Tab-separated table of C-alpha atoms and ligand atoms in Angstrom:
chain	number	residue	atom	x	y	z
A	1221	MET	CA	37.205	-86.902	364.325
A	1222	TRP	CA	39.512	-85.837	361.497
A	1223	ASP	CA	41.097	-82.642	360.220
A	1224	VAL	CA	40.566	-83.872	356.671
A	1225	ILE	CA	38.752	-86.753	355.044
A	1226	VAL	CA	39.947	-87.585	351.554
A	1227	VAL	CA	37.399	-89.359	349.386
A	1228	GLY	CA	39.173	-91.410	346.764
A	1229	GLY	CA	42.368	-93.379	347.175
A	1230	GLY	CA	43.866	-93.220	343.704
A	1231	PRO	CA	47.060	-91.233	342.843
A	1232	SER	CA	45.547	-87.827	343.680
A	1233	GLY	CA	43.919	-88.916	346.935
A	1234	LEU	CA	46.941	-90.829	348.218
A	1235	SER	CA	49.373	-88.062	347.261
A	1236	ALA	CA	47.130	-85.537	349.021
A	1237	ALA	CA	46.997	-87.753	352.126
A	1238	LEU	CA	50.797	-88.025	352.197
A	1239	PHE	CA	51.258	-84.250	352.188
A	1240	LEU	CA	48.408	-83.628	354.637
A	1241	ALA	CA	49.748	-86.212	357.093
A	1242	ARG	CA	53.267	-84.801	356.773
A	1243	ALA	CA	51.782	-81.413	357.669
A	1244	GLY	CA	50.794	-83.054	360.956
A	1245	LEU	CA	47.094	-83.305	360.175
A	1246	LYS	CA	44.792	-86.176	361.145
A	1247	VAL	CA	43.834	-87.477	357.723
A	1248	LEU	CA	41.636	-90.387	356.683
A	1249	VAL	CA	41.315	-91.717	353.151
A	1250	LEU	CA	38.170	-93.657	352.258
A	1251	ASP	CA	38.506	-95.552	348.990
A	1252	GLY	CA	36.039	-97.632	346.992
A	1253	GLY	CA	38.700	-99.563	345.090
A	1254	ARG	CA	37.914	-98.424	341.549
A	1255	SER	CA	41.061	-96.471	340.690
A	1256	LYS	CA	41.494	-96.251	336.927
A	1257	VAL	CA	45.113	-97.386	337.277
A	1258	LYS	CA	44.472	-100.611	339.208
A	1259	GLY	CA	44.302	-102.818	336.114
A	1260	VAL	CA	47.463	-101.548	334.426
A	1261	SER	CA	50.004	-104.371	334.141
A	1262	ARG	CA	52.880	-101.887	333.882
A	1263	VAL	CA	52.910	-98.089	334.331
A	1264	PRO	CA	55.812	-96.841	332.175
A	1265	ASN	CA	55.334	-93.104	332.637
A	1266	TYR	CA	55.335	-92.170	336.324
A	1267	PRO	CA	58.541	-90.017	336.245
A	1268	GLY	CA	61.166	-91.574	338.495
A	1269	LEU	CA	59.670	-95.044	338.930
A	1270	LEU	CA	62.087	-96.870	336.649
A	1271	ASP	CA	60.909	-100.339	337.619
A	1272	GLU	CA	57.586	-99.432	335.974
A	1273	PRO	CA	55.351	-101.347	338.418
A	1274	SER	CA	51.786	-102.458	337.720
A	1275	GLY	CA	49.045	-100.038	338.709
A	1276	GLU	CA	48.214	-102.334	341.617
A	1277	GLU	CA	51.796	-102.153	342.893
A	1278	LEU	CA	51.914	-98.387	342.407
A	1279	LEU	CA	48.765	-98.012	344.504
A	1280	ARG	CA	50.287	-100.180	347.235
A	1281	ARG	CA	53.421	-98.023	347.356
A	1282	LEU	CA	51.358	-94.809	347.395
A	1283	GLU	CA	49.258	-96.127	350.282
A	1284	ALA	CA	52.418	-97.168	352.125
A	1285	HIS	CA	53.953	-93.740	351.551
A	1286	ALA	CA	50.912	-91.987	353.049
A	1287	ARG	CA	50.645	-94.416	355.970
A	1288	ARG	CA	54.360	-94.019	356.606
A	1289	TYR	CA	53.742	-90.453	357.741
A	1290	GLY	CA	50.515	-90.949	359.681
A	1291	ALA	CA	47.672	-91.066	357.183
A	1292	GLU	CA	45.041	-93.749	357.607
A	1293	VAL	CA	43.841	-95.366	354.379
A	1294	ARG	CA	40.687	-97.451	354.628
A	1295	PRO	CA	38.485	-99.252	352.120
A	1296	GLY	CA	34.981	-97.825	352.025
A	1297	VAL	CA	32.368	-96.317	349.757
A	1298	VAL	CA	31.028	-92.899	350.710
A	1299	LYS	CA	27.296	-92.720	350.004
A	1300	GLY	CA	26.344	-89.805	352.199
A	1301	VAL	CA	27.739	-86.452	353.272
A	1302	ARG	CA	26.024	-84.076	355.689
A	1303	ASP	CA	27.181	-80.589	356.632
A	1304	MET	CA	26.519	-80.307	360.355
A	1305	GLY	CA	27.890	-76.779	360.672
A	1306	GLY	CA	31.589	-76.813	361.488
A	1307	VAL	CA	32.015	-80.486	360.718
A	1308	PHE	CA	31.122	-82.722	357.792
A	1309	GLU	CA	29.649	-86.143	358.448
A	1310	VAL	CA	30.684	-88.744	355.856
A	1311	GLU	CA	28.784	-92.025	355.690
A	1312	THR	CA	29.888	-95.393	354.322
A	1313	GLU	CA	28.448	-98.884	354.741
A	1314	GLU	CA	30.575	-99.286	357.865
A	1315	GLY	CA	29.535	-96.085	359.585
A	1316	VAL	CA	30.061	-92.361	359.993
A	1317	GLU	CA	33.259	-90.323	360.182
A	1318	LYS	CA	33.597	-86.601	360.888
A	1319	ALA	CA	36.022	-84.058	359.443
A	1320	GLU	CA	36.315	-80.284	359.304
A	1321	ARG	CA	37.479	-80.358	355.683
A	1322	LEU	CA	36.758	-82.690	352.766
A	1323	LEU	CA	38.975	-83.339	349.751
A	1324	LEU	CA	37.350	-85.096	346.803
A	1325	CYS	CA	39.739	-87.131	344.622
A	1326	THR	CA	36.908	-89.166	343.133
A	1327	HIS	CA	37.931	-89.075	339.439
A	1328	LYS	CA	34.915	-88.508	337.142
A	1329	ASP	CA	32.200	-89.868	339.463
A	1330	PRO	CA	29.605	-87.061	339.930
A	1331	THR	CA	27.869	-88.721	342.899
A	1332	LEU	CA	29.362	-86.711	345.769
A	1333	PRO	CA	29.691	-83.449	343.802
A	1334	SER	CA	25.953	-83.649	343.116
A	1335	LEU	CA	25.163	-84.378	346.776
A	1336	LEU	CA	26.920	-81.181	347.821
A	1337	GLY	CA	25.518	-79.144	344.950
A	1338	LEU	CA	29.044	-78.213	343.911
A	1339	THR	CA	29.339	-75.810	340.990
A	1340	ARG	CA	30.572	-77.648	337.904
A	1341	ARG	CA	32.946	-76.814	335.065
A	1342	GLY	CA	31.686	-79.005	332.264
A	1343	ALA	CA	31.658	-82.574	333.563
A	1344	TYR	CA	34.026	-81.701	336.412
A	1345	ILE	CA	34.006	-79.920	339.767
A	1346	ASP	CA	34.650	-76.191	339.355
A	1347	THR	CA	37.571	-74.898	341.447
A	1348	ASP	CA	39.932	-71.963	341.825
A	1349	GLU	CA	43.635	-72.453	341.046
A	1350	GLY	CA	44.152	-74.148	344.418
A	1351	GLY	CA	41.329	-76.688	344.260
A	1352	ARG	CA	38.722	-74.940	346.398
A	1353	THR	CA	35.203	-75.827	345.284
A	1354	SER	CA	32.112	-73.624	345.470
A	1355	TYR	CA	31.484	-75.138	348.913
A	1356	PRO	CA	33.544	-73.785	351.853
A	1357	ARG	CA	36.014	-76.300	353.307
A	1358	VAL	CA	35.375	-78.683	350.411
A	1359	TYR	CA	38.284	-79.214	347.997
A	1360	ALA	CA	38.894	-81.332	344.892
A	1361	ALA	CA	41.979	-82.624	343.079
A	1362	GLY	CA	43.015	-84.714	340.091
A	1363	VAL	CA	40.622	-85.795	337.358
A	1364	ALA	CA	37.744	-84.821	339.675
A	1365	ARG	CA	38.462	-81.153	338.997
A	1366	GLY	CA	39.307	-81.357	335.310
A	1367	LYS	CA	43.008	-82.251	335.314
A	1368	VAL	CA	42.507	-84.242	332.128
A	1369	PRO	CA	43.262	-86.238	330.116
A	1370	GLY	CA	43.949	-88.130	333.317
A	1371	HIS	CA	47.353	-89.635	334.023
A	1372	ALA	CA	48.758	-91.018	337.281
A	1373	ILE	CA	51.565	-88.495	337.693
A	1374	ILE	CA	49.261	-85.576	336.874
A	1375	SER	CA	46.716	-86.606	339.511
A	1376	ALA	CA	49.431	-87.293	342.085
A	1377	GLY	CA	50.889	-83.850	341.438
A	1378	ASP	CA	47.521	-82.141	341.783
A	1379	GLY	CA	46.645	-84.005	344.964
A	1380	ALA	CA	49.846	-82.686	346.527
A	1381	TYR	CA	49.271	-79.203	345.066
A	1382	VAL	CA	45.778	-78.878	346.518
A	1383	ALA	CA	46.883	-80.385	349.835
A	1384	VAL	CA	49.700	-77.866	350.101
A	1385	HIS	CA	47.288	-74.984	349.565
A	1386	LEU	CA	44.824	-76.483	352.044
A	1387	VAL	CA	47.622	-76.526	354.618
A	1388	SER	CA	48.681	-73.002	353.626
A	1389	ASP	CA	45.156	-71.807	354.453
A	1390	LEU	CA	45.369	-73.331	357.926
A	1391	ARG	CA	48.828	-71.977	358.728
A	1392	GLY	CA	48.139	-68.596	357.137
A	1393	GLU	CA	51.481	-68.766	355.341
A	1394	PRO	CA	52.916	-70.310	352.152
A	1395	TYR	CA	53.391	-73.928	353.229
A	1396	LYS	CA	56.440	-75.821	352.056
A	1397	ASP	CA	57.233	-79.434	352.933
A	1398	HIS	CA	60.953	-79.337	352.202
A	1399	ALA	CA	63.898	-81.381	353.456
A	1400	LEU	CA	67.608	-80.976	354.188
B	2896	FAD	C1	43.164	-99.106	330.804
B	2896	FAD	C2	43.802	-97.854	331.423
B	2896	FAD	C3	45.183	-97.717	331.333
B	2896	FAD	C4	45.872	-96.584	331.883
B	2896	FAD	N1	47.267	-96.502	331.769
B	2896	FAD	C5	47.927	-95.372	332.328
B	2896	FAD	C6	49.347	-95.273	332.232
B	2896	FAD	O1	50.089	-96.119	331.679
B	2896	FAD	N2	49.912	-94.128	332.812
B	2896	FAD	C7	49.180	-93.115	333.456
B	2896	FAD	O2	49.816	-92.146	333.930
B	2896	FAD	N3	47.816	-93.219	333.543
B	2896	FAD	C8	47.195	-94.322	332.996
B	2896	FAD	N4	45.794	-94.406	333.103
B	2896	FAD	C9	45.024	-93.333	333.781
B	2896	FAD	C10	45.272	-93.246	335.275
B	2896	FAD	O3	45.003	-94.526	335.850
B	2896	FAD	C11	44.402	-92.132	335.871
B	2896	FAD	O4	44.703	-90.902	335.224
B	2896	FAD	C12	44.638	-91.954	337.391
B	2896	FAD	O5	44.369	-93.179	338.078
B	2896	FAD	C13	43.749	-90.836	337.912
B	2896	FAD	O6	43.972	-90.658	339.312
B	2896	FAD	P1	42.841	-90.045	340.249
B	2896	FAD	O7	43.403	-90.003	341.601
B	2896	FAD	O8	42.365	-88.755	339.656
B	2896	FAD	O9	41.611	-91.079	340.198
B	2896	FAD	P2	41.477	-92.667	340.285
B	2896	FAD	O10	42.834	-93.269	340.394
B	2896	FAD	O11	40.537	-93.134	339.224
B	2896	FAD	O12	40.849	-92.837	341.724
B	2896	FAD	C14	39.532	-92.420	342.123
B	2896	FAD	C15	39.290	-93.245	343.359
B	2896	FAD	O13	38.233	-92.694	344.191
B	2896	FAD	C16	37.354	-93.759	344.560
B	2896	FAD	N5	36.006	-93.260	344.788
B	2896	FAD	C17	35.142	-92.637	343.926
B	2896	FAD	N6	33.979	-92.326	344.468
B	2896	FAD	C18	34.095	-92.780	345.775
B	2896	FAD	C19	33.183	-92.758	346.897
B	2896	FAD	N7	31.957	-92.233	346.799
B	2896	FAD	N8	33.605	-93.299	348.083
B	2896	FAD	C20	34.862	-93.830	348.154
B	2896	FAD	N9	35.789	-93.905	347.176
B	2896	FAD	C21	35.311	-93.340	345.980
B	2896	FAD	C22	37.470	-94.814	343.482
B	2896	FAD	O14	36.946	-96.066	343.860
B	2896	FAD	C23	38.952	-94.743	343.122
B	2896	FAD	O15	39.767	-95.672	343.818
B	2896	FAD	C24	45.099	-95.551	332.549
B	2896	FAD	C25	43.701	-95.706	332.633
B	2896	FAD	C26	43.026	-96.857	332.075
B	2896	FAD	C27	41.513	-96.935	332.220
């Protein structure tokens, strides 16, 4: 079982996983390997990354960062999602995984949003300021919820933003992941 299952392992999904894991949650990221940044030979505008790595390298570092604090990042394509009342069942080609909350960081792909009958805002998933969709316990972040035009740093920032508010809901208090 999982506290949260993040669908999509691009900047928003991996950033979300990092914050969720650091909050001590059991988080699993299922990614289909079609991040829009994967083919970039050199990302020159991710504030702070002065070596300007390729999109492929950036993804590797983001996955490492999330795994570093407990997140599990696995390749997989979600094709089914069933609400079983209290737990969501997510299905890939490899099998089924269960989570109480789902966070969609699926970029522009309307597949899963349509499966859940999520309310839309134009071509994107409709959400409140914090990323909560029209479906209870289902969240969205990054390009998936309209943070466009899409850029790596913007999606990463939103993934963390939504994750922080997801954690805040669970702890009933404004959650901050700060360090000395
Ligand atoms: C040619 C090109 C060049 C670019 N150059 C830059 C640049 O220099 N700087 C910059 O900041 N941005 C750049 N971008 C844009 C940037 O890559 C995106 O804004 C960013 O990747 C968006 O992050 P995201 O997390 O929202 O989605 P994405 O990174 O697109 O990730 C979505 C992920 O979810 C997965 N997914 C979707 N559906 C499922 C499913 N059902 N099951 C499992 N996994 C699923 C996908 O396979 C994918 O890995 C470029 C884009 C392109 C196309």
